[PDB]
Structure 1
Amino acid sequence: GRVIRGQRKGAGSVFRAHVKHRKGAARLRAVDFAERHGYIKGIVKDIIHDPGRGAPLAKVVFRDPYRFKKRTELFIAAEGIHTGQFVYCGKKAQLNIGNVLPVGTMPEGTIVCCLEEKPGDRGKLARASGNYATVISHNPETKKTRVKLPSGSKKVISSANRAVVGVVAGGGRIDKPILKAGRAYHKYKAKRNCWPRVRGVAMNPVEHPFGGGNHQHIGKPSTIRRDAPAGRKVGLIAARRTGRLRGTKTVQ
């Protein structure tokens, strides 16, 4: 039959990210001599609003240790920073809010954000607004460190990758109901075309596996496995359970 709505996301025709008005990618300084054997002073000039993002962007200017040139970078603004604060970065930087430093320096229980999976990818984990990680379980030999992620997973990572100390500013963004379709329209028009949200039962049988019949009913078990082909994984994908929760996660 007809290609479903879920298969059109891979074409990239009209489902691309609205990426022009974004001010740039929010990354850290890549690791160098001044960030592996010391620290360097950096000044946050202003903080701006990246569209399609509720977390504020921070324009932190640096100084190149090798050539006479001021380098301007784009950090995720931690909570409580302000313009004119000397944001430090490196190995032996002192632990304050905003000072990105490797996890081997900080003690256990240090609430950080914008950390790295592998050392040198400029910030991947815990980047959304109002989220953080928990640093625990250091090791003298075999330099690894457990981090509790916002999903609750305890990931073992390296001890050389960096993380800005604090939480991401903009916490509580999902506290307000959108309260009308207009603000949702403006929000998704800012982010990307992720909003042809039409009910799969309400649409046609030839366009979705669930639609059809004289009544709006599913008719088929919506729990569909991970071994399903493309165009089949609709509804619940590899659902190990369903219904109302009981406990927190019950996953080791």
Structure 2
Amino acid sequence: GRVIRGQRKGAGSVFRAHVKHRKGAARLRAVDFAERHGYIKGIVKDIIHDPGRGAPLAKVVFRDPYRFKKRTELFIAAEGIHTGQFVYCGKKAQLNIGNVLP
């Protein structure tokens, strides 16, 4: 017989995800010395809508501890997070909403 519709989805090329207007892979900040032994502080710049996703994203800006650069990450926005809020990261970070820690 003919190859069925659920079988045809694994080949791709029609059933692939529509990722043209998506803002990027939403993920946590990568673990380093600061987030492993202390905390690092960043700022929520804006909260954007990611297409094909009910959750909003937050663009959080940190500063690199080794280079004079500003690093941009896309977190998934906890409810209650506003812009201008400082988001802390690491083992010694306090326990508040929007504050990642182990």
Q: Secondary structure at the match of 2:70?
A: coil
Give the drift of 1:81: 0.6
Sequence identity percentage: 100
Partner residue, 2:98: 98
Q: Secondary structure at the match of 1:45?
A: strand
Give the drift of 1:48: 0.1
Matches of 1:13 and 1:100 in 2, distance apart?
38
Which runs of 5 or more residues in structure 2 are unaligned? none
Q: Deviations over 1:129-151 (max 9, x none)?
A: xxxxxxxxxxxxxxxxxxxxxxx
Structure with the bigger RCO (C-alpha within 8 Å, sep 6+) is: 2
Which runs of 5 or more residues in structure 1 are unaligned? 102-252
Give the drift of 1:53: 0.3
Matches of 2:66 and 2:4 in 1, distance apart?
54
Q: How many residues are matched? A: 101
Q: Which has the larger radius of gyration?
A: 1
Partner residue, 1:81: 81
Partner residue, 1:43: 43
Partner residue, 2:19: 19
Give the drift of 1:30: 1.1
Give the drift of 1:77: 0.2
Q: Secondary structure at the match of 1:71?
A: strand
Aligned-residue Cα RMSD (Å) equals 0.4
Give the drift of 1:13: 1.5
Q: Map of 1:62-81 to 2, 5 A cutoff?
A: 62-81=62-81
The runs of 4+ residues in structure 1 deviating greater than 2 Å are none
Question: Normalising by the residue count of structure 2, what TM-score does the alignment of the two structures yield?
Answer: 0.98
